[PDB]
């Protein structure tokens, strides 16, 4: 529903101290998301080189601040999509630590 982001951004404490402008939720298994770290190595949006794009399309939800959104009254727009996800990976085991973008 259109309510998804409004509820999720809140419950995930992404509206606690600020209105987190954008946030993407991935509706795939953890294993499939973690596996992206072993896939197409691409440049992060900030230029860093430890980002990886998923070979296949994943089901995601994009949460975006509405124009009337202002802390402490946050408000979001829910957008469902099926895109390749790009994440920044690090550590041992090599797993995502940042969600870069979607293409």
């Amino acid at each position: 529903s259109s309510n998804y982001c409004n509820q999720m951004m809140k419950s995930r404490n992404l509206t606690k101290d600020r209105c987190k402008p954008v946030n993407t939720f991935v509706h795939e298994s953890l294993a499939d998301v973690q596996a992206v770290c072993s896939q197409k190595n691409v440049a992060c949006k900030n230029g860093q080189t430890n980002c990886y794009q998923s070979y296949s399309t994943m089901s995601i939800t994009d949460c975006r601040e509405t124009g009337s959104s202002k802390y402490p009254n946050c408000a979001y727009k829910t957008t469902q999509a099926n895109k390749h996800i790009i994440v920044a990976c690090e550590g041992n085991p090599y797993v995502p630590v940042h969600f870069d973008a979607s293409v």
């Binding site: 999720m8 509706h27 795939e28 797993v95 940042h98």
Partner: peptide, 15 residues
């Protein structure tokens, strides 16, 4: 026990 890896799951995972 909170790590960058767990933080990612908290923020982005929703199976």
């Amino acid at each position: 026990k909170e790590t960058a890896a767990x933080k990612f799951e908290x923020q982005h995972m929703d199976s």
